[PDB]
């Protein structure tokens, strides 16, 4: 039974705060309507989101603790850090991040996404809204796999993530490959971190392939961002090239990040 094991609290965004009755562990209780589920998978027919969350169940990705099936919905019990703030609100309140802090955050996102790919999972909705900051541990967590897919090497022709983080080949041709599309969205994310908002709002900007910097950003960081946002997918860096880039060296540990920037 679901109502017996968890104390349900208020909305967080349909996601409710909750506590596991057993050990008072804070959880997030996420409800997904069957009628709205695009892709299904199996383990027992379940939403693909559950499939992907199980395949990645490492503190860099959110942990699915349990799930239930109801007549018209599935209920997902997800880990809830406390205290937490998502990266979107964090950037809104603090503005453009110092590069040392953006380096630590971006590095942790890179490790999390590498974890997803190694487990056969393509997230397809990397953005600041889908990243939680554990404010005490300085650890970041990738959330909301509701737009994801199994990782494959062939072309994708469907997409349901965030359009302003989607790559130009999707805008123009309705096709993309998983890894190079992910690298594009990471370029958008990195620009977002060091400039305080995403660079593109309109399709014409996305396919136009021009990056104007609205804040002081080091030449090394600008180079990495522009590389990630190469118009031609084959021109984009691999994850290894990103993490070997000069800008990415000497990252802070998560705990150092918390003590210098979050406490």
């Amino acid at each position: 039974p679901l109502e017996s094991q968890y104390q349900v609290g208020p909305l967080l965004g349909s996601v409710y705060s909750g506590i596991r009755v057993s050990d008072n562990l804070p959880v997030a209780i996420k409800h997904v309507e069957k009628d709205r589920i695009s892709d299904w998978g199996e383990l027992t027919r379940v939403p693909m989101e559950v499939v992907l969350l199980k395949k990645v169940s490492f503190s860099g990705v959110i942990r699915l603790l349990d799930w239930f099936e109801r007549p018209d919905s599935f209920v997902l019990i997800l880990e809830r850090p406390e205290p937490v703030q998502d990266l979107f609100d964090f950037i809104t309140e603090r503005g453009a991040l110092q590069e040392e802090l953006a380096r630590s955050f971006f590095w942790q996102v890179l490790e999390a996404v590498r974890h997803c790919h190694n487990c056969g999972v393509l997230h397809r909705d990397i953005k600041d809204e889908n990243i939680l900051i554990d404010l005490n541990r300085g650890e970041l967590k990738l959330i909301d796999f509701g737009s994801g897919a199994l990782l494959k090497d062939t072309v994708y022709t469907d997409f349901d993530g965030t359009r302003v983080y989607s790559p130009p080949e999707w805008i123009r041709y309705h096709r993309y490959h998983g890894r190079s599309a992910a690298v594009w969205s990471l370029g958008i994310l990195l620009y977002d971190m060091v400039c305080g908002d995403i660079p593109f709002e309109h399709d014409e900007e996305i396919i136009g392939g021009q990056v104007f910097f609205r804040q002081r950003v080091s030449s090394e960081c600008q180079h990495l961002i522009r590389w990630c946002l190469a118009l031609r997918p084959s021109d984009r860096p691999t994850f290894e090239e990103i993490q070997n880039h000069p800008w990415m060296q000497d990252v802070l540990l998560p705990q150092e990040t918390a003590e210098i920037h979050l406490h």
Binding site: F88, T92, D125, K127, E129, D144, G146, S147, D160, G161, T162, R163, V164, Y165, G196, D197
Partner: peptide
């Protein structure tokens, strides 16, 4: 300028 969330 208006920074905003973007639904998926």
């Amino acid at each position: 300028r208006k920074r905003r969330r973007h639904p998926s």
